[model samples]
Target: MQILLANPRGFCAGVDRAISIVENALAIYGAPIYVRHEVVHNRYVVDSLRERGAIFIEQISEVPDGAILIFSAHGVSQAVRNEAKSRDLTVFDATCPLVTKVHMEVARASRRGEESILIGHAGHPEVEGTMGQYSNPEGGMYLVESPDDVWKLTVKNEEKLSFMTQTTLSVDDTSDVIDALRKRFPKIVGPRKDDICYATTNRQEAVRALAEQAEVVLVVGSKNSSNSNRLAELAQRMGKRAFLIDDAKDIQEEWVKEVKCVGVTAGASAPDILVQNVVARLQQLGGGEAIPLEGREENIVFEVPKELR
Candidate 1:
């Protein structure tokens, strides 16, 4: 069995920045630096940080007042922000700039008195953070996970409509919903560019390019990671047998039995080490020497805050 490794498959710039923020916080502030959520979605990332003395908490209440608190890459609701402030906690925001861009778009729409139509999955931390940005008194923002959700919206004013999206959504998945949104509200304005983050768009594009050639695609990521799940789903959508796994240990021999070629990729939050480990494991399974497929080389970089730097 031959193996094809996707390019542009590991940690995106934002994930890199976030992990650095956590690491820097530890270096500067010492052990037990508190993070409100996983700095990123990958357990490997979170666990590595945890081992290095980063403490993960779901609520601000978990952290003591006046402590250092770093927000996750998913961003946070205004309510969470206020809570952090109310406690007088020292804050370090690790929110991805792209997610922050979506929040800013929502704020601009709200100030313009236009209703926001958010395209994302409910219950996702990023979706929650993004929807939280729209603090409407009533019917402030609408959430659409699919094209059908777009048809169900009842906005206060059709002319005063604006749409934003979660940064980690599938490009193909959002396109149909976006088209439906445009058809339903022709006057609705969208972001200057697509709201899907560059990393997400790139990873999906790579997966699509790799999917057409491989008999199966293995997406290395955690189940809860939105972008990770989308990577696997993307290959399945292309008629390839796709499996989402946390690491190489999850690889099943039967699934890859005598397969000619298996394609491998990882989510935006996944680390390169995980992908390398997967490739190594596949070799032990008698998968032939892994070959790197030609794909885009991502040159993007994001900086950590000055305080952390």
Candidate 2:
């Protein structure tokens, strides 16, 4: 059996910055530092931080007054920030800069007398956070998930409208939806560059490359991870069998049967250790030779919050 691993598989720069913020905060502020939402969406990362006294909560109301709160890397709404300010809480924003850029684009469009639409999942943390940025008194941002959602949109002024998208969305799908949006609203503006982050694009590209050569593709990532799910989808879209699993333990033998070549990639939040474990399991299952399918090199890094430094 032959196994192909992908480069730039795990721990994107944003995830790195988020985890660092929590660890640095713990070092500087001591234990019991409260984080609103998972600092990143990975269970292992959250559990490791919880062991170090990081408290995770769903809402700001759950945090006590004056408690130090860190926003997750997915970002948060302006309303949530206002609530934190109203309660006089010490807050640190761990929102990813790429996600933050989308929020800013929405805010900028709205401020310039333009209506803005956000292309994202309805209830994702990043979507919710980006929506929060545009929820001021004038009007709120609209959410459109698909080209069909674009048809249902009823903006006040079609001529003065713009759009931003979630960073972790499928690149191919987003382009299709963007095309539909352009066809419907001729004047609609989009980001000067693609909103899909470099990590998301590269990971999906790697999956596509692997799916072409492998009979089965195993994506090592949590199901809830959007990028991870997209990687699996990319493989399936290419007519290869794909499985999204958290680790090697989740790999099914039935999926591997008759598969001489397997392609494996991990999500941004997944640890390298998990990938190694999956490779070890594959080795035990008949010992496959491992090879790396090189893709784009990702050297992006976001800084920790100023407060931490």
Candidate 3:
């Protein structure tokens, strides 16, 4: 069995910054630092931080007043921000700059009384955070997951519509939703470019190229990771069997048996170590030398808070 690896996979710039925030917070503030969510939707990352004394919680009430609190990379709703402020928690926001861009878009549209439509999965923290940014009393924000959602959508005014997308989403699928929205609401406004971030777009493009050559694709990331799921789905859509696994332990022998070549990649939130582990596991299972495929080069870097430095 041949092992093929996708380049430009794992640990995107924003994920790097988010993880750095937790580590820097721990080093600067000492242990017991509280994080509002999984910093970047990777099980290994969250577990490693947990071992280092970072407490992950879903609610602001879970943290004590006056404790150090950090927002997740997924960002949070304005209500969560206010709640944290009310409790006097010393806060560090780990929100990716790209997600913050969408938040600003929502806020701007809300100010103009434009009913905002967010193209993202429901219940996702990023989606909730961005949708919450809309605070227009005259109109409101809507969440549309797919093109079908566009067909069934109802709004206050068609001409006063604007759309924003979650930064980490399937680039191709989002285009379909955006196209549908444009067809129905010709006057609808949106971001100058679609909101899918650079990392998400690049990794998916790499996976598409990988899927073209491999019989099966393995995506290394947590089940809850949006970008990881999209990578697996994109491969499957390209007529290859795809598995989304958190680590090497999740690999199934039967899924890979008799496969001539298996492609491996990771989500933006996943670490390179996980990919290495996956490759080693496949080798143990009789896979041949793992070869890395050439893909886009990513040099984007986000800086941690100055206080942490």
Candidate 4:
């Protein structure tokens, strides 16, 4: 009956900046602004933007020529930008600066006659964007999800190999994968610091801390949210029951019945109101005392683009 709220949950600065870009663009450019994908991969955020006249498209070809286009926060490949340029679309880039940093690293490694390998989930928008940064003819990037994939890799230059990761990934899992990469490619180079975003690290750590005390953990985030999914996995890995839900509506009584302690966390793209709403629903459902499980202290804030300001 008790609820333990996880601190450092919901709305990382990058997601905030991405959503604001769309809102500001809608205000400045008027209706019918085309977005190539979900700005931040949250259903609520996407639905809200759609109501504001933003058009979400999966492919660049779907966008009308000369229409205003905004890239998602997950970033986009260079091919997407070039295609937009060819179509003469007025483009706004909503890629998070952190993700952009990875893109720059990938391009720099490629320019130096090195082959870049991206460690990420296949088909992820961020991976697509980062891979787009380097052209295929230039001995471009490779994708690997696990250590096992390393053996399957065929690079142009093994000595000139480097790896980059998606910003939102399980920290422990990524470290193991990195260790495997080092073992396989003794000379493989990577970012000196971990590529997983601070928000992801903090949120996961918070969930781990809460899982030790709570009987069940509920992650408030869209199913498609990578970081949220990782949090749920982390909890379950700790032998605690964990569920990823879009909101309180997704929480069923069957999951909460007889559970004495519940831990709740939200994804980076989720809004704080959703978390509070879930809490309210739990309280109505016979929630006990609520406490916060402290974890990381995040002071990070990504600035909105000059146009938005």
Candidate 5:
């Protein structure tokens, strides 16, 4: 058996920055710092942080007044921010700069009193946050998950319309939806560049390259990770057997028993340690050499706030 590892997998700049924010806060402010949600979606990272005294909470109300609070990498809505401000929580924003870009676009559209269509999976924190950014009284934002959803979508003013997407999605993932949106609303506008971030595009392209060579693919990420799910979905869409596993233990021997080559990739939120473990598990399964596919190296970094630095 041969193991093909996807280069440029795991730990995108935003996730790196978000995780670092938590660590920096813990060091500077002490333990019991409250994060409104998983700083990033990986369970292992969350559990480790929890052990180190990071208290992950679902609501600001749960956090004691004056407690330190950090927003997840997936940006929070203005309402959440307002609540934290009202409660006087010392806040450090871990929201990705790219996601913040989308939020700015949504808020701008709302200011113009234009209806915004958000392209994302429903109930995702990022989606919820992006949607919350739009607060136009007459024309608000609507969620469109797919082209089919576009067919069922309705808005107050079709002519005065704009669209923005969850930053984690890819061009291919939302192109059809965009096309559908444009067809329905000829005057619809979107971001100057596609809303999909650089990390997402590169990781997805690398996965496509991996799926082409390997018989089976294993994606290392938590189940709730949107980007990781997309990586597994992309590989499977390419007609290869793909599994989204949180760690090496999630791999089923039966899936790779007869396979000659296995591809391994990790989501942006996942750590390199998880990918290394998966490689080890695959090699131990049959003692095959693990090789990396040639891919672009990402150097983008979102700096932590100056206070933390």
Candidate 6:
């Protein structure tokens, strides 16, 4: 048996900055620092931070007045920010710069008197945040998940329509949706560049490269993570058996049975440790020689707030 380990598989800079914000806050402000949601989707990262005095809360009401509040990397709605301000909390913004860029575009679209069409999974925190950036009373934002959803959209003004997407998404899936949106609203405006993040594009490309070579593929990431699920979906779409797992423990022995070669990768929010553990598990499971497969090298880094630094 042989192992094809996908390179550039874990820990994009956004996740790293978000985790660092929480750590820096704990060091500077002491325990009980409040974060409104899971800083990232991974349970391992969240559990580790929880033990280090980060208080993960679902609502701003749960945080005491004047306590430090950190927004998740997934971003938050403007309503959330205003609510936190009203509560007089010391705020630390951990929204990924890419997500923030989309928020700014939404605001720009609204200012020019346009209706926003957000292309992303509904209920994702980043989608919620970007959609809320448009405060137009008459023409608001609508969520569009797929090409089918794009067909169902009835916008206030086709000429005044604009689109923005979640940073983490299947590039191939999103491209088709974008094409559908444009077919319906030919005049729709969007970002000069595609909205999907570099990490997402690179990882998906790596997995596509991996899927062609391996009999089975394993994606290490939290279930709710958008980019992680897309990796598994893309692999399976390529006709290989694929599984998305939180970590090594989630990999079952039966999935590996009779597999001559296995491909291993991870989501952007995932840590390198998870990928390492999966390789170790495969070795102990059936004794495969794990080899690192090169795809791309990423050096992008988002700047953290000065306060955290």
Q: 1-309, model 2: which lDDT tens digit per residue?
A: 889997768899999999999999999989889999988878778889999999999999899877889999999988898889899688888888889888888788767767888888988999998887874456557899999999888988888888889999899999988998899999988876459999998898888888889899898888678889999999998998989898888988888877789888899988888899999999888747788987888777888868787
Cα lDDT tens digits for candidate 5, 1-309? 999999889999999999999999999989889999999999999999999999999899999978999999999999999999889799999999999989998999889888988999899999989999988798788999899999998888788998988888866869888989889899999876468898898889999999999999999999999999999999999999999999999989999998988999999999999988988988889947789899998888889999998
* Local accuracy of candidate 3 as per-residue lDDT tens digits, 1-309: 999999889999889999999999999879999999999899999999999999999999999978999999999998999999888789999999989988988888889888989999999999989988988799888999888999998898987888899998999889999999999899999876589999999999999999999999999999999999999999999889999999999999999988899999999999999999999999998898999999898888999988888
Quantify how close model 5 is to the true structure by its C-alpha RMSD in Å: 1.1
The estimated TM-scores of all candidates read: 0.97, 0.96, 0.98, 0.97, 0.98, 0.97
Return the TM-score for candidate 5, rounded to 2 decimals: 0.98
Task: Give the best candidate by lDDT.
Answer: 3
TM-score of 2: 0.96
Q: What global local distance difference test value does model 5 have?
A: 0.91
What's the number of clashes in each of the models?
A: 0, 1, 0, 5, 0, 0
> After superposing candidate 5, which stretches have Cα over 4 Å from the reference?
none
Task: State candidate 3's TM-score.
Answer: 0.98
Instruction: Please tell me which model should have the higher TM-score, number 4 or number 5.
Output: 5
Candidate 4 collision pairs? 1-260, 1-288, 76-129, 77-129, 78-132
> If the candidates were sorted by their lDDT against the true structure, best first, what order would they fall in?
3, 5, 6, 1, 4, 2
Question: lDDT by residue for model 6 over 1-309, one digit each (tens)?
Answer: 789988778899999999999999999989989999999999889988999999999899999987999999999988999999888799999999988888998988778777989889988888888888888787778999999999887877888888899999889988999899888998988876469998999999999999999999999999889999999999999999999998888889999988999999999888888888888999998857788887798989987799788
Tens-digit lDDT track of model 1 for 1-309:
889988779899999999999999999989889998888999999999999989999999999877899999999999999999989799999999989988998877766667888889899899889888877575378899998888877878888788888888888878888888889899988876469988898988899888988999999999899998998998998899999999999999998888889999999889889998999998888788888888887898999999988
